[PDB]
Amino acid sequence: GEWEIIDIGPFTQNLGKFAVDEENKIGQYGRLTFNKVIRPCMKKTIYENEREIKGYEYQLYVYASDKLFRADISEDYKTRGRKLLRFNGPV
User: Fold this and answer.
1) 3-state per-residue secondary structure call for 7-57
2) Contact (CB, 8 A) for 74 and 57
3) Residue 15 and residue 55: Cα distance in Å, rounded?
4) Residue extents of the structural domains in the chain
5) How far is the C-alpha of 17 from the C-alpha of 1, rounded, in Å?
6) How many C-beta atoms lie closer than 10 Å to residue 8's C-beta?
7) φ, ψ for residue 67 (rounded to 5)?
8) Which chain regions cross the lipid bilayer?
9) Residue 10: phi, psi to the nearest 5?
C-alpha cells in the first residue's frame, strides 16, 4: 500500500465538504463538519503502484465543530473497497 500527508490546504477544503457529505450521508446530519482547523490530515491508499488501483482511503485527523479526531474515508477501486468515512481516533 502507500501513504502521504498533506499541507493544511487541500484536505482542509475537503474536510468541510467531504465530511458534511459523507458525515451527513453516513447519518450524521447533526450539524456541519468544519470549525477549528486541519493539521494532522494524512492520506493512505492500498492500491498497486503502476498497473492498477485497488483501494483509496484517507485519514484526516483534525478538529472542526465536533470532529475531535479524524474524518476517515475509503473508496473501492479494483478489488472492491467502498465509499465511507469515520469520525474518531481522537487526540
Assistant:
1) CCCHHHHHHHHHHHHHHHHHCCCCCCCCCCECCCEEEEECCCCCCCCCEEE
2) yes
3) 19
4) 1-91
5) 26
6) 14
7) -105, 75
8) none
9) -80, -60
Alpha helix segments (H runs only) across the chain: 10-14, 24-26
Report how this structure was experimentally obtained.
NMR
Q: How far, in Å, CA of 8 to CA of 64, rounded?
A: 13
Domain 1-91 CATH assignment equals 3.30.565.10 = no
At CA 43, angle to CA 34 and CA 47, rounded to 5? Answer: 140
Retrieve residue 7's grid coordinates.
Answer: 499541507
* Paired residues of 5 in beta bridges: 42
Please give the grid coordinates belonging to residue 3: 501513504
What separation in angstroms does the CA of 32 have from each of 17, 52, 61, 78? 9, 35, 16, 32
